[PDB]
Amino acid sequence: SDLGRKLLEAARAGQDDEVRILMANGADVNAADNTGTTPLHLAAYSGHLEIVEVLLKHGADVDASDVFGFTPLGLAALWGHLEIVEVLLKHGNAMGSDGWTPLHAAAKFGYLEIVEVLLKHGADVNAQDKRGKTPFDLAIDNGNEDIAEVL
Amino acid sequence: EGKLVIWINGDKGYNGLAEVGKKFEKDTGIKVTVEHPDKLEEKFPQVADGPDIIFWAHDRFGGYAQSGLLAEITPDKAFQDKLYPFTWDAVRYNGKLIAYPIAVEALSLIYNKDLLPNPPKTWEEIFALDKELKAKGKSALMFNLQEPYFTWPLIAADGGYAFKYENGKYDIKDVGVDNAGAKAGLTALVYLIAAKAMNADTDYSIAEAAFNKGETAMTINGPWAWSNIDTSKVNYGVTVLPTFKGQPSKPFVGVLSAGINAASPNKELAKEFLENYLLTDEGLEAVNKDKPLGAVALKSYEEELAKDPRIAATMENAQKGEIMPNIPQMSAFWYAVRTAVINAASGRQTVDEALKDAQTRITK
């Protein structure tokens, strides 16, 4: 709770050594704040691969979601962190607050390699949202012909 | 008593107002006490411990006046001509003047030119802009998310509105809080939050500290905040707000006004103070030098300060937005949106849910 807050702070800030210390003093790997945000959520969205691997090594839940339904995989894909995405798919279509999957995000923001790895790992191309937009629909709407082509 | 108690919101130049009071005090012998209590706009109708004069944006004074909490001011034509007519229109309720207009305020985009030499023109850019800024240990934008005053310009961009104005009055049944425009604006904000591009617990103090310390490249605020940035040795620019759907953000234009309590035994001392001490180039200068007022209602001092580019940006953003209504239902408006925005922003409710409740509670 208190250490947990400090762990969320270090993970969000990218303090590999502070995370190392907090874990040494018994910090909870899966510490969740008010919004269900965990250290892995924060490390993934912030692009700190080293912390991501450490948390996973310590038993962090990869498929944890927040009140918005966002998983660490969704943030890594949303922020274009290919290497984190691969690690998260290494450890294991989850829809968000509007039915958007990590593939909707990668397509929306032109993360081609991420799209390739998601599809390579069983991403649902038919994933629909509230407006019935498939990741193909988002690729075309945002002018990502190339990623649309692979779809 | 035979005194003058004055209330003004803590984010204004109350030390400079206190200095106008001390000039009045010594010239007439009437002690003046300026206070800046928390939630003063809510305590005033509870206690009008009542102050002689209350300072606030005009939007809340129509609720005060309808409840009978304010006296009618008695300025003659000669004095009304000192201020711009549209400022009098904003402090007019049911055909009678219920307060003195002081200054016109609007929100503007404020950016740190060392982190952002050219600011974005759109809300869609902020997300990508924040990704490149966090590698530098910084943030893109940080402003008060606890008060809908600051998020409303985005909510009203695509179509949101408060109360429709028809044939001279505001229709209390035509509320645009649940329409598509407002859902679009608030959806963008909630996603910037869910994407961790914004923090939902961001309030005025956090945003001001972060910006004045060069930790975030942008913020949204009004004139009263400029002084604190000047002293922070931050190279900043005050410019138009980012567009949404290619459409401009529409901030609510408030008019800081001073209303006289009806229960005040000191209504003529209040008139003398407000009329002949505060609403002068010297009284307005004193308050403005403490914390800027924006485009003041006084024609002389406003015409004098008109060349300030930050004020020119202020009235440019105001020209995109709409003057606040003063009807008593505005209170319900601000209370419902505020709860909606904080619940959507935090995931407690969905944008549709939060805005559905709010629309109904305002149209009750």
Ligand SMILES: CC(C)=CCC/C(C)=C\CC/C(C)=C/COP(=O)(O)OP(=O)(O)O
């Ligand atoms: C901060 C942020 C952008 C978070 C996004 C949420 C997310 C993780 C994934 C999907 C977002 C998406 C496709 C938005 C617009 O779709 P659209 O093509 O229909 O565009 P529009 O509906 O806004 O017009």
Ligand SMILES: OC[C@H]1O[C@H](O[C@H]2[C@H](O)[C@@H](O)[C@@H](O)O[C@@H]2CO)[C@H](O)[C@@H](O)[C@@H]1O
């Ligand atoms: O958030 C609702 C709030 O917005 C306005 O208050 C502004 C005020 O106009 C500004 O001058 C500055 O002081 O910040 C306030 C918001 O924090 C409305 O005038 C007010 O009625 C309303 O409560």
